[PDB]
Amino acid sequence: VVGGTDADEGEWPWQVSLHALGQGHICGASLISPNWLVSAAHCYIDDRGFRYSDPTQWTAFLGLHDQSQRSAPGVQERRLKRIISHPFFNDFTFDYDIALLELEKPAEYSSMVRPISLPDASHVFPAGKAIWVTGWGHTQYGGTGALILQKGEIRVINQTTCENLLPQQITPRMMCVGFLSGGVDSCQGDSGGPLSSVEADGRIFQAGVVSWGDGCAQRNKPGVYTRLPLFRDWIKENTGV
Ligand SMILES: *O=[P@]([O])([C]C1=[C][C]=C(C([N])=[N])[C]=[C]1)OC1=[C][C]=[C][C]=[C]1
């Protein structure tokens, strides 16, 4: 997250850190039940040097605040039993960029570990709405990741505007969120983590999933996120959640 600030400890207890064997933190995820996480499909695509699609080559850290303190009170470490990537995911366009991660053993909810509510299929997060992104990604483009979980408040962008800012790249599965003036944005390493919509009365919903962007925090280049309401039935079908 570029242009954000340190989260309070336990402030985003649904935020998860996913480490690939021998590489440290690669992507985020969100806790949605004791056994399941939501993340981005593109994080789990093999490359020539490493099988990111192999669930056994991941470790999930639940209840984490500081990447240098992974044995701190509150942290629950888990392996993945499986990675369900969306059937329509396209690694060229990043359409349908969403995956479901099954933990090998369930999380136990605590002050540091708690699920985020899913939005139902009819839920709308209208253009203009201020919502939050969190993660341990780069805090500057080309920079390095954050040790301490970062948070940044960003706004949903109109879809026609989004399409035009990133021409021939936006599908209905995607949403731009950020500022047209840049400054605050997700960045490398935030992928797969949640957009958290915090309402005045304490209702909190996951609005989307960090997916991709053109640079980070540039003007007229807001981050692109996977919309979550459209996937409510797919999540129910595949996980029971
Ligand atoms: O999801 P990622 O962190 C890539 C990414 C880049 C930029 C934005 C943005 N809003 N400007 C969002 C997402 O995935 C990666 C890629 C390489 C290494 C680790 C994670």
30 and 86 together in one domain: yes
What distances in angstroms separate CA 39 from CA 7, 147, 170, 201, 211, one per listed residue? Answer: 20, 20, 19, 26, 9
Q: Decide if 224 contacts 176 (C-beta within 8 A).
A: yes
HSE-CB for 116 with a 13 A CA cutoff: 30
Counting Cα atoms < 13 Å in the Cβ hemisphere of 228 gives 26
Tokens of 120: 């139902």
Q: Of 108, 85, 120, whose CA–CA distance to 35 is shortest?
A: 108
Quick one: tokens of 215?
A: 């640079």
Closest approach atom of ligand 1 to CA 185: 10
| Dihedral angle sign, alpha carbons of residues 8, 5, 179, 222 | negative
State yes or no: is 191 an active-site residue: yes
Query: Which atom of ligand 1 is found nearest the CA of 188?
Result: 3
CA 213, CA 92: separation in Å to the nearest integer?
A: 14
Give the max Cα distance, the chain.
Answer: 48
Cβ(40)–Cβ(226) under 8 Å? yes
Q: Rounded to a whole number, what is the distance in angstroms from the first to the last CA of the chain?
A: 29
Count of beta carbons in the 10 Å neighbourhood of residue 66: 15
What lines the ligand 1 site, CB under 6 Å? 26-27, 40, 137, 185-191, 210, 212-213, 216, 223
Specify the number of domains making up the chain. Answer: 2
85 noted as active-site residue = no
List phi, psi (to 5°) of 153.
Answer: -90, 130
- For residue 27, report the phi and psi dihedrals to the nearest 5 degrees: -140, 165
Q: CA 120 to CA 116: how far, in whole Å? A: 13
Closest CA to 158 of 173, 171, 176: 176
In whole angstroms, what is the distance from residue 209 CA to residue 37 CA?
11
Q: What angle do CA 238, 204, 8 make, to 5 degrees?
A: 110
Do 184 and 2 form a contact (C-beta atoms < 8 A)? Answer: yes
Contact 40, 211 (CB under 8 A): yes
Q: Which strand (E) or helix (H) includes residue 25?
A: strand 24-31
- Supply φ then ψ for residue 200, to 5 degrees: -60, -40
Q: Are residues 33 and 94 in the same domain?
A: yes
Gap between the Cα atoms of 210 and 205, Å rounded = 15
Structural domain harbouring 151: 1-12+116-229
Q: What is the Cα 60 distance to its own chain's centre? A: 13
Which one of 131, 134, 188 would you pick to mutate in the ligand 1 pocket, going by the greatest count of ligand atoms within 8 A of its CB? 188
Ligand 1 centroid to Cα of residue 65, in Å, is 20
CA of 161 to the centre of ligand 1 (A): 21
- Model resolution, angstroms: 1.2
How far apart (Å, rounded) are the C-alpha atoms in residues 207 and 227?
Answer: 7
Q: How many CB atoms are located within 10 Å of the residue 21 CB?
A: 13
Examine the domain organization and report whether 209 and 237 are in the same domain: no
> CA 237 to CA 110: how far, in whole Å?
27
Token readout for 227 is 């919309």
The span from the CA of 132 to the CA of 43, in Å, is: 21
* Residues 108, 27 share a domain: yes
Determination approach: X-ray
DSSP 222: -
Q: What's the CATH code of the domain at 6?
A: 2.40.10.10
d(CA 58, CA 51): 10
Distance CA 223, CA 184 (A): 9
Residues ≥6 apart with Cβ < 8 Å to 49: none
> Are residues 80 and 170 both part of a single domain?
no
35 plus 108 within the same structural domain: yes
What whole-number distance in Å separates Cα of residue 148 and Cα of residue 219? Answer: 26
